[PDB]
Structures are given as structure tokens and as C-alpha cells.
Symmetry: C3
Subunit: 358 residues, 3 copies
Amino acid sequence: VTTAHSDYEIVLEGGSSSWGKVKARAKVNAPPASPLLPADADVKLNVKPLDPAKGFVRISAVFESIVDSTKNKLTIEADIANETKERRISVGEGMVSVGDFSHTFSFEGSVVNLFYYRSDAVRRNVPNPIYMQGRQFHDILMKVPLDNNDLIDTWEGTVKAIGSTGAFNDWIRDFWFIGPAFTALNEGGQRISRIEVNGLNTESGPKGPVGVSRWRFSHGGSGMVDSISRWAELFPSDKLNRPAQVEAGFRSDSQGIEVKVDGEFPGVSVDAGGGLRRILNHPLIPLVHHGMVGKFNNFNVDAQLKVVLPKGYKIRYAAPQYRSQNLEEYRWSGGAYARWVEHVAKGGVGQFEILYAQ
Amino acid sequence: VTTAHSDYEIVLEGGSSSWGKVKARAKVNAPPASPLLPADADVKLNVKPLDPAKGFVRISAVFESIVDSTKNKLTIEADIANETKERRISVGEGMVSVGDFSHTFSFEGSVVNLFYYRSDAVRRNVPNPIYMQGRQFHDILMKVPLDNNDLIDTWEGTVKAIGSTGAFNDWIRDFWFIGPAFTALNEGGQRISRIEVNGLNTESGPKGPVGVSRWRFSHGGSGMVDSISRWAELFPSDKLNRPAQVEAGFRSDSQGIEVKVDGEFPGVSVDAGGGLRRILNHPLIPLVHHGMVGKFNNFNVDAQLKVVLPKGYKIRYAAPQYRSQNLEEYRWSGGAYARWVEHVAKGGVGQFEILYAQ
Amino acid sequence: VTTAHSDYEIVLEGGSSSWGKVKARAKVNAPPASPLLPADADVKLNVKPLDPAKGFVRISAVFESIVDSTKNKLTIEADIANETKERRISVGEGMVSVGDFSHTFSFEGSVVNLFYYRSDAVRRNVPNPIYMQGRQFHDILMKVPLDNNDLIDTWEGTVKAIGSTGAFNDWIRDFWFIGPAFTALNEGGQRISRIEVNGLNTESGPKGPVGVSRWRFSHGGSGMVDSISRWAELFPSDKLNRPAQVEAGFRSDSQGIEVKVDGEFPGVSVDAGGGLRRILNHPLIPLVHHGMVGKFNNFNVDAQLKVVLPKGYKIRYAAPQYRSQNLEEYRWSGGAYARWVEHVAKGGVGQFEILYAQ
Ligand code: BCL
Ligand code: BCL
Ligand code: BCL
Ligand code: BCL
Ligand code: BCL
Ligand code: BCL
């Protein structure tokens, strides 16, 4: 018998605060859909206020994994700020390593997020809008020291390809969205444009030649792509009054999958209007993308959610309904909640709303 | 335990008549995949002979819904006629309303449906062909009175966009196929071309300015798109000797879905050749599209179908086989029928054929 | 209760040999997702060494089916050889028949398979790479005697279309990937280019006019398309020291599906390095494509695998683990193996690795 066991905990700050602590654990005795096993990964994300006056934060990410004995790592650290409601700017650096190979990089880039329409007729009549169609434009300048022969080979190969292959800006997407990543684009109503290569040259860096590229692309979303529809919400820099962090990891092999998440960050709750608040709307891409793997083994659900509201707050509406309550702490399990967990784990996006207030 | 309960009833006219009464009810205690709940809708479609000499019918549609408290409505009424086997013409009017906002519209449009091949070698050798690849071309002239400020804003915004944005005819499809509608295109082997904007201007209508647009698009189908493969069959104007109608609705929320259908129309049965008739072949798009939502909760099937043949007719072949019979009335439930209901509810298109005769 | 019963047997040659005998049987009491039933098919593939000095083999394929009473057949026989590691050449002939219609054909064609990158940094650090992004270019010259009126009609229709329709090279793909074949492309991360028509003319053949076309297309793969990622491996001509063959067939209708496979060919095992061997990595397209039909009825798994190693060899690693062993013969059933069978039958590609050695 295949059984998914999971526990989730949300502990909320009150007042005007959107912050929450989020913890999760899950295990299921079914294999992942990776054609290489075992596959283990640990991820740590950190972000701190940097310059509140200019709205800059400093964010870092560390990814480490082991896949069929191969050890991988990627880190990236960047300073990011909104310039306007639509244009965001970044500058950063990082590295990637795989077994005995590694390389570094630095970059700067701007992203401009544009909705296809704006209408007060929609805004005033839909209290909790979900879909927002739009397109996001990246402009990136990246640099990689060419300080081993593999880097040199790839740089020269790519220079040669760009020079000789008229369809490079098109076919590069076949390379980029490796394996089933390609398939996931259409699944989420996401489109990636042909790229533009605006600049390609070698620089004389302090330790040697540096490969420098300037390039652009856009990606379109029909409304489910959270990176576009919830662009401002997903970067709550104006709510980051202290450092935030999240650590997560999984272990997986032919026998099953185990996962753990432990984080604290702003944006967990939202002003719902009318003096109510809600847990933020569930982003759609995680459910749709995970939906591509959640349907391969039947499973029973053994799931519990615990939500701790701030002192003095009460739930006004929850659907699925909670099972029990002890002051500010509410618990869901079994019944309609278990059924909703099955639904979203298989790719469904049916709404689970929690509205609360003092 | 998740259980889908459903009942279907088909009552057929005899002789040369293709007409039937179709009733259905279903309920299932699982949530819909809507990221806004509750979601309730009622739909009424009507069509009557208008000018049998020119083949015009007058069709009307009313859609009403409530989604997370927002009240929606759209109506459309049109006169439609075949000009040729491939070209159909229409003229009509309607309105849309959402909360405190509303607008009207009128239009005329032609649609030309073209198959990619015609071959007697296929026709004479395949007795019940299903797939037909082809492409359908729309040419539309629509008008909307710009009689509130939101209409004015959207009209001017769109005029501005068409003027400034070279990729408008491309990216408009991201806006148009909102949310998971985008994803459904590829699922059904359906392609939407870039649009052509042939005309855009303001008219001085009786009550004020009117926004007028003339535009075109084609959509391609690899064979499953019923709008293309069964183009003539889906508009049985030559069989409409009296008014036809269908009413349907659903209620849904975090706890489940309930639905009801009650209609009467031509085209329910078909001449199968050899003096046999069949219930029409199941259209594929409904099953494929619904397949995108039917896989998120395991369910047991409690389904019954009742088919009442005209007096004196008998079933010659049915697969899945029926369970019971009382004169002209045949009933299916359990066993292989329940298994077929599960199959098609999850997106399968395995054939369930009923052939009958006197 | 829906139950899938299946048995698989692999019997391996030893030494440096990659050959194996592969047998399979499966049955399941659920309907196929074919909108025409019954659907029965038998396939026979044969290949023999032809000219070991030039690397030519002679391969033949016979497909026969019956679909809703219509009898179909297609045969193809060809000589195929690698010219280089990337370029393969072929010349051959065949026929197609459907009911009272038939036609023949002959052809020659080259295919060039190109990976998007080559990197020693990947090669030396990933011991068993799976994804390889790339693009494959076909150049085909085919001839069909126009020796009945239907052939003449289609030839003239196509000549007319190519002449009049600017989007022919684009829309031809709607015709080509009939029905759900269209949808399967994106599912497997596969792209088909617009075609190029380089030549179209009529020849005066011995018995009459012959329609001759010269045309090209490429197809891209993001890494799962085995035709691209495992290009050399899939044509083990250098391992074909004697004839190989496989016969397979299925019978299906509204009640269920039964299938049988019986074959012997090189390429069943692979040198894994370190003096180990493995069963070849599971190709991804079969699992992904079948995944599009494997999710419509819940089923229980009654599956057994038997692997017979060459004398004196032992399994070093298997995950899922085997259940029993008798000398060189190992058996899997139930437990984690049954769970893996469910997973891959529904479209999962989680790795099942068997490594063995003396
Ligand atoms: C990922 C989905 C979208 C996308 C959506 C966005 C969004 C949204 C943003 C960017 C931004 C950036 N993108 Mg982009 N971007 C995509 C694909 C790309 C690709 C590529 C080759 O595929 C590249 C090179 C880039 C490059 C870049 C940079 C120019 C820029 C800064 C990145 C950074 O510092 O990351 C650092 C990396 C990480 C922090 C790793 C973790 C990333 C995941 C997604 C974050 C999960 C947050 C978690 C749920 C809660 C975190 C709480 C913690 C306490 C922080 N994008 C795809 C198409 N991109 C930012 C920008 O505008 O800069 C100007 C920005 O806000
Ligand atoms: C470059 C990337 C972008 C960015 C892209 C996104 C995207 C895209 C999304 C978010 C979302 C969220 N982000 Mg943000 N985000 C950025 C910076 C920040 C900052 C900040 C001050 O810098 C903060 C505090 C946040 C905070 C938040 C939350 C409001 C929200 C997640 C809520 C939740 O409950 O998660 C619960 C958390 C978990 C269940 C697990 C989180 C742990 C794992 C490790 C996080 C990463 C998972 C992902 C698969 C990894 C992909 C990595 C790439 C391949 C490189 N982001 C940068 C600028 N963020 C999500 C959301 O809901 O938006 C509305 C969302 O979809
Ligand atoms: C919907 C799937 C296909 C499509 C397939 C068809 C087909 C097929 C036809 C049209 C026709 C029309 N289409 Mg078109 N069309 C599509 C997308 C569009 C879009 C758009 C922005 O997406 C627009 C503006 C149009 C516009 C139009 C008009 C020019 C024209 C008349 C519409 C009408 O009166 O509807 C009135 C609206 C309704 C009746 C609502 C109900 C619609 C559903 C689909 C009908 C279900 C029938 C039910 C199962 C049985 C009904 C029995 C009742 C007793 C009647 N189409 C997509 C791509 N279109 C018609 C034509 O050729 O006119 C010249 C026609 O026959
Ligand atoms: C503008 C739209 C087009 C059109 C488009 C289609 C399409 C597309 C299809 C049909 C199909 C059918 N149509 Mg027609 N149809 C038109 C006009 C008509 C007229 C007429 C004389 O005007 C008649 C009598 C019919 C009759 C019929 C039947 C032969 C057949 C449904 C059989 C059945 O058992 O349904 C059983 C009915 C039900 C199970 C439920 C019906 C109730 C619901 C409310 C109907 C609409 C559902 C749909 C999801 C709503 C989408 C609305 C849009 C978003 C606006 N149509 C107009 C001209 N029609 C279907 C078929 O099988 O074709 C071969 C089909 O796929
Ligand atoms: C099928 C998936 C890919 C593809 C991948 C490949 C690969 C890979 C190769 C070709 C090759 C060829 N392709 Mg191609 N090809 C595709 C689509 C096409 C289409 C089309 C209209 O769709 C056409 C006309 C062609 C035409 C051709 C010829 C030019 C050439 C020889 C074919 C042959 O003899 O087949 C004979 C037909 C059969 C043997 C039928 C069986 C085919 C199945 C796929 C084989 C299963 C093997 C089985 C698992 C184990 C067999 C063991 C037996 C003992 C042999 N391809 C799609 C896009 N094509 C070959 C080449 O390069 O020639 C120069 C080659 O190696
Ligand atoms: C024109 C077609 C190409 C070609 C295309 C492919 C493709 C594509 C693939 C293979 C794969 C394999 N091929 Mg090869 N292959 C060709 C010629 C050969 C020759 C030869 C010396 O000529 C040999 C010995 C082989 C041998 C092999 C094996 C190494 C491997 C299957 C292993 C296994 O366990 O299958 C177990 C076998 C079965 C489970 C059942 C096989 C029985 C059925 C009848 C085979 C065909 C099924 C398929 C759905 C039919 C599609 C037909 C088309 C619509 C026309 N191929 C020709 C040149 N071959 C597969 C692989 O794993 O590659 C890494 C794979 O994906």
C-alpha cells in the first residue's frame, strides 16, 4: 500500500505583519520520476535588507545535490531592487560545480514585467483575482572567467555556432529547457521567445580571458505563471524589515521520497480587504508542474495542517473546514482536507481559502 | 470515499428522425480545479428555424455564473446559415456583464472550414471515420458601443498597443486563451494562428462612438478538433424542423460538484449505413479537455445510462453491453459500463458504440 | 476490479555480447483510448547483416492491423548504414494497403543527428548520462507509382496545394501528426520543423507515371527523445553478427487489451564501466507516450520479471530488489517492483537499474 504522510505548520505574525514561519515534512513510498536515482538535494535561501532607502535586498541561494553518485552545486548571490512597479534590477555572482568541474560567473540584469491589459472594470468587480496574462522581458549581461579548457571549448563552440547557425536563437531553447523542462512550459501556459544575442566578446580579466555575453528574451504567460501574474507580490522587499530564510531538502530513490522545509519570510498572509486577512493564494506553477509527476502511483493521504494565528485572531472562513481548534491553533486532517491534498498533489488547483481576523 | 454518481437518459425519435431528448445528472464529492470557489453556472441554448428557404436558423445562448461572489453574464443571439458546404455566415448581437460593469456588441462573421485532403480511397474503405485534419478561417466584423469610461480606456489602450507593438498579432493569443485555456489547445491537437487586424476605427453610432474592428484568424486541427472534423454534422440546420433547446448548470465548491443537463435537439442519432443507425460518435474535445481535470481524485463510479429506442427498434450491437432491457428501453450500469465511465471521465476516448435498427 | 497481468523475460548472452532474448505478455481488462474499436495489430521486424565491410544491414518491417473491420497493412524493407557517427544513409521500398486500396513506394534518405553541445566536463563527471539535447535532419527522395486514380487525385491535389498555399510547409504538420500524434510531440519535448520541398516532379516509369518528391525536415529534442539522444545506440549495426528479429501483437476492444512480444537482438545489455554491465537504460519516449493512455482506469498490478544472466554472472545491484534467485535466474514481483510497474505504465520514468558481473 502506497501512503503519503505529510505535516505542515504555519505560524503567523499579527498586526500589519505578513510574516509567517512555514514548516513541512512529507514522505511517500513511491519512486520519483527521475531517470537517474538516487537523487538527493539540499537548498538554502537567505535574504536581508541591504539599502532600505533604495529598496535593495541581498539574496543568496545555495543548491547542492547528488544524483546517481554525481555531486552538484550551484550558488548565486545578488542585490535586487525595484526601479519601478514594472522594472526590477539585479547584480550578482555565483558558481556551479559538478564532480571535478567548476566555474564562476557574475552578472547584471533587468527584468520588466508588463500585463497585457489594465482595467478598473475587472479590478472593482473581482475581489480576489487570480489569472493575469502578461509578458516579462529579461536583459542580461553575464561574465564567466574562461579559466579551464572545458570553458574555453564551450565558449569557442558557442561562438562558432552563433556565427554559423541561423536558427541558433530558436533552437537554443531545445538545449535550455532540458528533458521534461521543455514540456512543462506549455503545461503552465508559459512561452519562451527566441533569444536576442546583442553582444558577445572576450575581456581581459585580472586572471585571464573572460567570456562576456549580452542577451535578451521574453516569456509570456496566459495567467497561471506566477512569475508574471504576481510579480510584485513575489518580491516583498518593502515587507522585509529583517532577514528571512528557508531551508529545504529531499532524499529520493527507487523506494520513495522524503522532504523537509523550514522557513520564515514575509508574504505568508495578505490583507483580504474588509478588515480580513487570508493566507496567500496558492501559486499555480508549483501545483501544475508537480502535477506532471504526481499521478504515477495511487496513494492514500495521511496529512495534517496546523495553522497558528496571532493572539486574539480567529478564523472567519475556511474551506475545507478545520477539524479542531485550541485557541489560536487550528488543525486540518482527514475528510475534505485529505481529499484536497490528494487533488493538489496530482495537479489540481481547487481553492483552499483561509480568511481570518480579530 | 470519493464517489461519482451519475445518470444519463437518451430518448430517440424514429423513422428518418435524428432527434433525441438528452438528460443527465452527476454529482461527485471532490473539488473542481478552479482557483476561485464557489463556482456556479447556468446555461440555456435555444435555436429555431428562421428561413428554411435560405437555411437560416436563429440561435441564442445565455450564460450566467457566480464565481467567488462575482456575478457574470453573457448572452449572444445570432442568425446563422450555410452558404456552402465549407462556408458558413452569421450576424448577431449580445452583451456581457460582470458585477457593476457591462457592455453590448453586434457582429457579422464568416467561417470557412477546409479539410487538408479528400480521398475516395479513405472514404470507401473506412466505414466510420473519426479523425479529419483541417483548418478553419474566421473573418469577423464586430462593434461595441463605447458607452462607459472602461470601454473607452480599453479601446484606446488597444489602439495604442496595435500601433506600437509589432508582436501584437502573436502575443494577443496569450491574453485570449486565459489561464489553462492556453494549455488545452495543444492537448486537443488544436493550433491558433496569429491574428490579422484588417480594420480598426471608431463610428458615430446613434447614442455615441462605437469601436469597430475587422479581424481574422485560422485554427488548425490534427483530427480530434470536432469543430473542424465534424463541421457539417455539428450544425444540423437541415434537420431542424422545429425549435430545439438545452439547459444545463452546475454548482461547485470545495466539497464537490453537481451538474444537470436537460435538452432536445436533432443529431443525436445517425444513419450508420446498411439500414442501421447509431448514437452519434462521441465528440473528442469534451473528453480530452475534461481529461485535464478528471484525474485529481480517485473515485468509484455509480453510473447508469438509459436509452429508449423508438417503438419497434432493437439494439443490434452495444459495447459495453447493456445490463437490462424492457421493450425499447435499455439500461447500462456497473461492470464494463462503469469502467468505461471512469475511462472517459479521466480523458479516455475508447469507443462505446450503440447500433440499432427495426 | 481492473487488474493488469503481465510477465516479462530477459535471457542474456555473455562475454562481450550485448544480445538478449526478450519476451513479454500483458493483459488488462480496461479499454484502449482508441475512438474506433476493436483494434488488433501484428508487427514483425527483421534485420540481417548485409555488407559488414560497409556496415550495411537489411531491415524489414511488416505492420498489419484491423480497426473497426478495416484491414490495414504496411511493409517497408531497407538497406541502412552509418556513413559517419552523425550521418546515416538508407535506400528501400515498401507498400501500404487499406481495404481495397493500395500503393507502393521506393525511397532513399539520409539522416544527420547533431547534438547541441559536446563537453568533456559532463562526460567525465556523469557516469550514466540520460538527457542529450539535439536535432536530427532528414533528406528524403521518395517515389510512388501513380497507378490508380486515387494516387493521381492525391498527387494532383498536393501539387495544386503546394503551388497555391504559402503556409503549406507549416500546415502540413497538422495533417501529418494525425489525431493525438500531434499532442505527443510536446509531451516528449519533441519539435518538428516546417518542411522544405526541394523537388516535385513526375517521372516516366516502366509501367506509367511516378510521383517523385524530394523534401527535408528537422526534429529537435530537449533530451528525452531517444531517436536523438541515443542515436548510435539505437542502431547497433556493429553488434549485428547474425540475424535479429522481433514479433509483437495486440488484440483490443471495449473489454480489454492483450499483448505479446517475442524477440532477440543485440543491445539488450551494455558495458557499464568498471567491469560491470547493465540492462540498457529504459528509453523515455515509450514511457512518456504510453503515459498519455495509462491513466484512465485504476488498476492493480500482477507483474513478474524474470532475468536470466549468462552462466557464472551475478547481480551486483538491482533497485527495485529482486524477490528470488535460482543460480543465474532472478525474479521480481510484488512490492516495490509492482509499484514501479504501476509508475512506468502511467508515464513515470523513475530508474529501475540492474547491474551485473562475473
Ligand atoms: C524562474 C521563473 C522565470 C523567471 C522569473 C524571474 C523573476 C520572478 C525574477 C527574475 C529575476 C532574475 N532573473 Mg529570471 N526567470 C526565468 C529564467 C531566467 C534565466 C534562465 C536562463 O532561465 C536567467 C539567466 C534569469 C536571470 C535572472 C536575473 C537577471 C534576475 C536575478 C536572478 C537571481 O538573482 O536569482 C537568484 C536565485 C534564487 C533566489 C534562487 C531561488 C529562486 C526561486 C524561484 C525562489 C523561490 C522563493 C521561495 C518560494 C520563497 C523564498 C523566501 C526566501 C527567504 C528568499 N532568469 C524563468 C523564465 N526572474 C529577478 C529580477 O527581476 O531581477 C532583476 C526576479 O525578481
Ligand atoms: C529570483 C527569484 C525571485 C523570486 C521569485 C518567486 C517566485 C517565482 C515565487 C515566489 C514566491 C514567494 N516569494 Mg519570492 N522571489 C524573490 C525574492 C523573495 C524575497 C525577497 C525579499 O527577496 C522574499 C521574502 C520572497 C518571498 C516569497 C513569498 C511571498 C512567496 C512564497 C510563499 C510561501 O508560502 O512559500 C512556501 C515555501 C515553500 C513551500 C518552499 C520553499 C522552499 C524551496 C527551496 C523554495 C524554492 C523552490 C523552487 C522549486 C526552487 C527552483 C530553483 C531554480 C531552479 C533556480 N521572495 C526573487 C527576487 N518568489 C512564490 C509565490 O507564491 O509567489 C506569489 C512563487 O511562486
Ligand atoms: C468554439 C470552438 C472554436 C470555434 C468554432 C466555431 C464553429 C464550429 C462555428 C463557429 C461560428 C462562429 N464563431 Mg468561432 N470558434 C472558436 C472561436 C471564436 C471566437 C473567439 C474570440 O475565440 C470568436 C469571436 C468566434 C466567432 C464566431 C462567429 C463569427 C460565428 C458565430 C458564433 C455564434 O453565434 O455563437 C453563438 C454561441 C453559442 C450557441 C454558444 C454555445 C456554443 C457551444 C460550442 C455549442 C454547443 C452545442 C451543444 C453541444 C448542442 C446545442 C444544441 C442547442 C439546441 C443549439 N469564434 C474556437 C476556435 N465557431 C459559427 C459559424 O460558422 O458562423 C458563421 C460555427 O458554426
Ligand atoms: C457557434 C456554435 C455552433 C455549434 C458548435 C458545436 C460544437 C463545437 C459541437 C457541437 C455539437 C453538437 N451540436 Mg452544434 N453548433 C451550432 C449549432 C447547433 C444547432 C443548430 C441548428 O443551430 C443544433 C441543433 C446543434 C446540435 C448539435 C448536436 C448534433 C451535437 C451535440 C450532441 C449531443 O449529444 O450533445 C449532448 C449535449 C450535452 C452533453 C450538453 C450540452 C449542454 C451544454 C450547455 C452545451 C455547451 C457546452 C460547452 C462546454 C459550452 C462552451 C461555451 C463557449 C465557451 C461559448 N448545434 C452552432 C452553429 N456543436 C457537438 C458534437 O458532438 O458535434 C459532433 C460538438 O462538439
Ligand atoms: C520514428 C521517430 C522519428 C525518426 C527517427 C529515425 C531514426 C532513429 C532513424 C530514422 C531513419 C529513417 N527515417 Mg526517420 N524518424 C521520424 C520520422 C520519419 C518520417 C515521417 C514522415 O514521419 C519519414 C518519412 C522518415 C524517414 C526515414 C528514412 C529516411 C530512414 C529509414 C527508415 C526505415 O527504413 O524505416 C524502417 C522502419 C522500421 C524498421 C519500422 C520499425 C521502426 C521502430 C521505431 C523501430 C523499433 C526497434 C525495436 C524497438 C527493436 C527492433 C529490433 C529488430 C530486430 C530490428 N522518418 C520521427 C520524427 N528515422 C533511419 C536512418 O537514419 O536512415 C538513414 C534511422 O536510423
Ligand atoms: C528506422 C528505425 C531505426 C531504429 C530506431 C529505434 C528507436 C527509435 C529505438 C530503438 C531501440 C532499440 N533498437 Mg533500433 N532502430 C533501427 C535498427 C535497429 C537494429 C538494426 C541492426 O538495424 C537493431 C538490432 C536495433 C535494436 C534496438 C535495441 C538496442 C533497442 C530496443 C531494446 C529493447 O529492449 O527493446 C525491447 C522491445 C520491445 C519492448 C518491443 C519491440 C516490439 C515492437 C514491435 C517494436 C516497435 C514498437 C514501435 C511502437 C513501433 C512504431 C512503428 C512506426 C510507427 C513505423 N535497432 C532502425 C535503423 N531503435 C529503442 C531503444 O531503447 O533505443 C535506445 C528505441 O527507442
